[PDB]
């Protein structure tokens, strides 16, 4: 529903990108006070309550958020450094990243890089990978990433969302296919 969606979009923006511009100071792990997040959200959507934020967190289908005690964080997507959980994805054999075709000259030479984020974000889900690439351009390619290649190279893959995984970078040898 549009109420849930518009408050969640604002939560993700505050918690991933501009907490300080709403007066919040994330701790090392990226958590802000839940009460303080609620007041920040209410500067935009005055109907928001803590109970509604708790409902958004628990019902989020991607696993975007985490509440711990009286604090809340985004679980990935940040454009500032945070220490996240190191729940390691050891089971996935391939992972996916969608990107505009125009990026293949750089990506296939340099690998995937975190760009303005802290981590490279990949997915266990091809459609969601492609839909993320579509945010950046109409002509997108599906990158297929060999998870064992990454692990062997010392790049741990972490369970950030239900489908989202994070990794420090993806060297080009680990990009097996671009479709």
Residue 136 touches ligand A1EJC, criterion: CB under 6 A: no
118 interacts with, out of ligand A1EJC, ligand AR6, none, CB within 5 to 8 A per kind: none
Binding segment (CB under 6 A) for ligand A1EJC, from list 5-13, 35-43, 86-94, 167-175? 5-13
Query: Which residue in 33, 127, 93, 69 sits closest to 14, CA to CA?
Result: 33
CA 106 to chain centre: 22
78 interacts with, out of ligand A1EJC, ligand AR6, none, CB within 5 to 8 A per kind: none
Residue 75 touches ligand AR6, criterion: CB under 6 A: no
3-state secondary structure of 79: coil
Residue 141 touches ligand AR6, criterion: CB under 6 A: no
Least Å distance, CB 112 to ligand AR6, is: 4
Q: Is the dihedral of CA 56, 60, 64, 70 positive or negative?
A: positive
Residue 131 touches ligand AR6, criterion: CB under 6 A: no
3-state secondary structure of 174: helix
Q: Which of 16, 75, 159, 165 binds ligand A1EJC (CB under 6 A)?
A: 16
Q: Which of 22, 30, 64, 95 binds ligand A1EJC (CB under 6 A)?
A: 64
**How many CB atoms are closer than 10 A to CB 4?**
13
Total count of residues recorded for the chain: 179
Q: Which of 3, 9, 35, 136 binds ligand A1EJC (CB under 6 A)?
A: 9
3-state secondary structure of 175: strand
Find the radius of gyration of the CA atoms of the chain. 17
Residue 115 touches ligand AR6, criterion: CB under 6 A: yes
């Amino acid at each position: 529903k549009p109420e849930r969606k518009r408050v969640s979009k604002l939560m993700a923006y505050i918690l991933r990108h501009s907490p300080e511009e709403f007066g919040l100071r994330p701790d090392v792990e990226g958590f802000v006070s839940l009460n303080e997040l609620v007041n920040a959200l209410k500067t935009v959507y005055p109907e928001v309550t803590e109970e509604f934020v708790r409902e958004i967190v628990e019902n989020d289908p991607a696993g975007r958020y985490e509440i711990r005690g009286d604090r809340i964080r985004a679980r990935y997507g940040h454009s500032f450094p945070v220490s996240l959980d190191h729940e390691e994805d050891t089971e996935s054999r391939f992972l996916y990243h969608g990107t505009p075709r125009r990026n293949l000259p750089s990506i296939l030479k340099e690998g995937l890089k975190p760009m303005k984020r802290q981590y490279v974000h990949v997915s266990t889900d091809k459609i969601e990978a492609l839909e993320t690439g579509r945010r950046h351009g109409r002509e997108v390619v599906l990158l297929v990433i060999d998870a064992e290649c990454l692990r062997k190279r010392g790049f741990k893959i972490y369970k950030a969302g239900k489908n989202v995984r994070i990794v420090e970078r993806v060297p080009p040898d680990c990009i097996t296919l671009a479709v």
